[PDB]
Amino acid sequence: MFLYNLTLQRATGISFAIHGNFSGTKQQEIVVSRGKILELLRPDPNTGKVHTLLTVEVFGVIRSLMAFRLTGGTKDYIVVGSDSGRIVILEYQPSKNMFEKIHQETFGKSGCRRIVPGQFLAVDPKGRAVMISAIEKQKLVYILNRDAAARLTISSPLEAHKANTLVYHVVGVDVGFENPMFACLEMDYEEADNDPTGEAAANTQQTLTFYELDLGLNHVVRKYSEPLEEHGNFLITVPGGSDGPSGVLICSENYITYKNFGDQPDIRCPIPRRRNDLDDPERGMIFVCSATHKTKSMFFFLAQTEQGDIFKITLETDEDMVTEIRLKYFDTVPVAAAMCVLKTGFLFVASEFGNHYLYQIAHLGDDDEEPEFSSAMPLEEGDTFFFQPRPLKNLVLVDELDSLSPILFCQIADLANEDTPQLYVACGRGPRSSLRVLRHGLEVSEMAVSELPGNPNAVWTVRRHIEDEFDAYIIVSFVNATLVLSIGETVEEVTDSGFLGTTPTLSCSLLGDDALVQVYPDGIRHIRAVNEWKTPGKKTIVKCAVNQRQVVIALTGGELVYFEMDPSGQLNEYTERKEMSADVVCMSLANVPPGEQRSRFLAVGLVDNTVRIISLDPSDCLQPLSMQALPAQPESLCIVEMFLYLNIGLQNGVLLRTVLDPGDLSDTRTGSRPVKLFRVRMQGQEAVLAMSSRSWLSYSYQSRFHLTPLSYETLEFASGFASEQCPEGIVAISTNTLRILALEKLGAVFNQVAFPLQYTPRKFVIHPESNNLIIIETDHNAYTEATKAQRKQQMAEEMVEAERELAAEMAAAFLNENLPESIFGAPKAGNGQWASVIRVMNPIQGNTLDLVQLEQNEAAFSVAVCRFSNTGEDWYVLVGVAKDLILNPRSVAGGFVYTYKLVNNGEKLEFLHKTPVEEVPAAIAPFQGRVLIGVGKLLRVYDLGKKKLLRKCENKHIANYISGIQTIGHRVIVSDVQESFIWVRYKRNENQLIIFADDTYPRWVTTASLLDYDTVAGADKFGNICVVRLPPNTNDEVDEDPTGNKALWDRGLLNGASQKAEVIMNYHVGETVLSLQKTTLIPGGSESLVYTTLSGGIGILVPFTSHEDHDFFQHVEMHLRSEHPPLCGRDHLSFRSYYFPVKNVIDGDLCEQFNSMEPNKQKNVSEELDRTPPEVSKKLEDIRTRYAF
């Protein structure tokens, strides 16, 4: 089973962000790690929107990023720490839009290893030195120097290894131009390992150690080391020299502490808590991340707590000594993986999960309605500062990067009765959870809608002057009339300014700098800022093709007439009229380049079912250049630049792109409707809009094309639009309607509609008749609303029973104080506390139809919708619940299965009964009109019963906890939590569940899918996919002995079952998969295995249909592994072979990097493939379009 992997949706989750002048210019970019991908973002300081400049799969695990700058340099470098074990320095090359590898220095073996450096990266602020540190023992420092040519130079690593030492964080200390110093929060574990009592573990203290690099002597000395009062989670570099007092803030449990070496005393400030906090009082508070803002005369830090609350932190100084730390509450935003404050006054908040935000900083947090806390204030221990969380005051939201991380569950189905299946995606964590519906397409924004009388057939948009930044007129052609509208303040109908005529119009263009030209079947009208051209004899104008300085028309009998405008301004008809082999059905004429005075090539489509290119230069005017036969009669033509391409839309739904540089072409069926072609302006470039049954948009993106449909109805005509109301839109007419639309959000390849959920969604099931979703949502550390209310009631009573008139008011205020969990965080209940709900939801618009709330500390883990044989038509929802589950160390008070009778056409849950079970019912699967429930390691068949479920059969031979259950016929595939796949047969007459086969490997299975009766695709916690198959002549007709013989004498193999599954495929995706589904993503496309991930990636695995594909892509992958090796210094084959050797999968994420190589390499690689680069690019496009969009 040979397979090709393609990413459809790149990962959207962010784990690191760094900011800098990576382009080497005044403006700042952000480089973000998405784990497997490195990406460059530009926030536009004008429009607010954040543009992705570049995305690169690095086929490795990024573990650290730093920006750094050599002293005197204008441009920032990216230094990368990764699982590779090689330190990589990249420079962004703005001209080529690529990350260029400036250095790659090697120090260890690959993988996320304990003692090999890569996890922690620290750079000296001046950029003189970089230290890469492992979690344990090994730390390496590389000196950085600038050569005469100004190219970067990396020194040989200097060893700084201290055995038995765990490092929590390392940061570079700003010492100005004194010797570089790094600071590490470290704990030595030697004594704990040698103490049988455990006292040594308890009395081991973290230390802050400063390692100084003596630049002169090339050695790293462990110059100071000091025990901390409490364990810090991370460090912040404080500005030094002229900028600040140097030193490093330690963020720790409940505290922030400032330390510097020498005479500087410790200053410590407690982290202010929320007043009236509903959280468990046992919970400490940490800062999760920080940003620094350094300004010409001052600096401050932003630090965010676990609740999402940001504090502005400032340091008061007397001489060079810090005297106090001051904390002002700034704003509350979603909990962040990273924060970057940009020089232009924006805060970028890379969310831990879900959508990322750009905020403008409206105010610097220099109000005083809200108090500023200080390390100098008198306070007790156990006592604390309290602040009030309140809506956004210092921040204004300006962009939101819609992000799928984490995808917890997925179903690909049509639930809308569209042509194409949608992806129903369970997303987010906690109160930022959502169900998202993904469609292949672009979001459309209806700017205006005005109904038109009669049946309009055409429309154009014409400027008044060439220098006009916005259009002036919209012209609509009906059957017997054309109408002109002035797009002024009131978009009103005009008559005088326009002239035109009563008759239908074939074209309206701005010919001169200010001259308008109308083409109608009875002739041509020219309107200077009026010259009339009657059609010769009884003929009429059939087709036309206009330009900035050219006008070509096609008359009945296929007679071409050519007009060219002279610089004086008038039109001059050519002294010759050419006839064609047949009548003309469509024409196209490329726009004139800014420098030239006329375009050369003219595309003409004939009833001959052929297209012909004709020169318009006076040397060979109206002369044949190159013809071409087409599978059907053409409907539209469009020449466009990005190279030159001729787009051909036929009478049937087929569309063709051809390259007229010399050429070859590629085609695809859109059919059902004749394809029309229009010129549209998208993202400041020329894009083509093809119209059939759907409106598709073809546009080039970094020399890589895209053909994405519009999530919209059928349209009949369209033209480019640009006004002050809509700077870059499209005017489109449909049957008896005129519409002004805009394409604002690409949303990548998948537009999203999101419906909020209340807790983290674990699973959902589609109810088959009414197509509603039954969703189970469940969080740990959570209060149910009943408990959340009761907690609130007791805290109000306690606040009164702590003056008492004011206390009563504050308690009444607090009972009404009801800040949204989505913004301020769901209040964290203690360990082992759970909240869970069952929601019935409509997938068309996410209205909750029904909402069952479960008891406090009930956690729903499984759900199924089914019929039972006894009750026939009646529908049931079975929900499996853990009671009082503790995760770590694991224990549980057993579980329950709740049964509900689905009623009111699957819109309401009628509770039926609650059935106890001994351990978590972790999987439920309908089987042969009965339900199969996996309770811990026990697989049981349960009949509905009346007052409780009845256990018809049970199997106790499963090795460990059961995570999932798939079924096909009498076969049951059980996913063990660690021991991978077990195949079971239900013996129907004999009432037995028999294990007949197992895997030969441990796999930490997360999800599974059946490919066929014998074959299972699985995914695991370690970012792998596998396919396991039963070998031919595997027998499922197996016994289990009634006396005991088959557990005593007769037996299985290697301490597993007697028969074994073959692993026929292995592949490291690079990221954890929780959904697998075999499906077709496009109507009349090939079937594919679709997967989804915790970083929000969507990808496919697609079967090669023949060796003519397989062995070609095998050779492509082989050459790209050597000619285009992974950016951050990994071996690609090693990365795809992370946990098991790669088997029968070719990486299309690598193969599609062919298109992103420089032409020097594209040539060389294509030569070793016996092909030219366009043929390689086409064969890559062909396999994507065959299954993927």
Binding site: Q119, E136, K137, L166, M187, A192, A201, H231, F353, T1072
Partner: protein, 70 residues
């Protein structure tokens, strides 16, 4: 061979259950810290911030299996 001692978490014929499991647990926590997706999974499962999950794993590195046998 002697040179294997350059590398922590190797063993030898008198390596105990406790020594071996403490290396498995320490290597596991370091792997969880590096693999962003494996860290995602635990943060979602516990309903806890990725920064607190990392901190809790670092705290577990000191004595991951409880004290040495005796």
């Amino acid at each position: 061979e002697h040179l294997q001692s350059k590398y922590i978490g190797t063993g030898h014929a008198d390596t105990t259950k406790w020594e071996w499991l403490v290396n498995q647990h320490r290597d596991s926590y370091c792997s969880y810290m590096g693999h962003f997706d494996l860290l995602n999974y635990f943060a979602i499962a516990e309903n806890e911030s990725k920064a607190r999950v990392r901190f809790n794993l670092m705290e577990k590195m000191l004595q991951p299996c409880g004290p040495p046998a005796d």
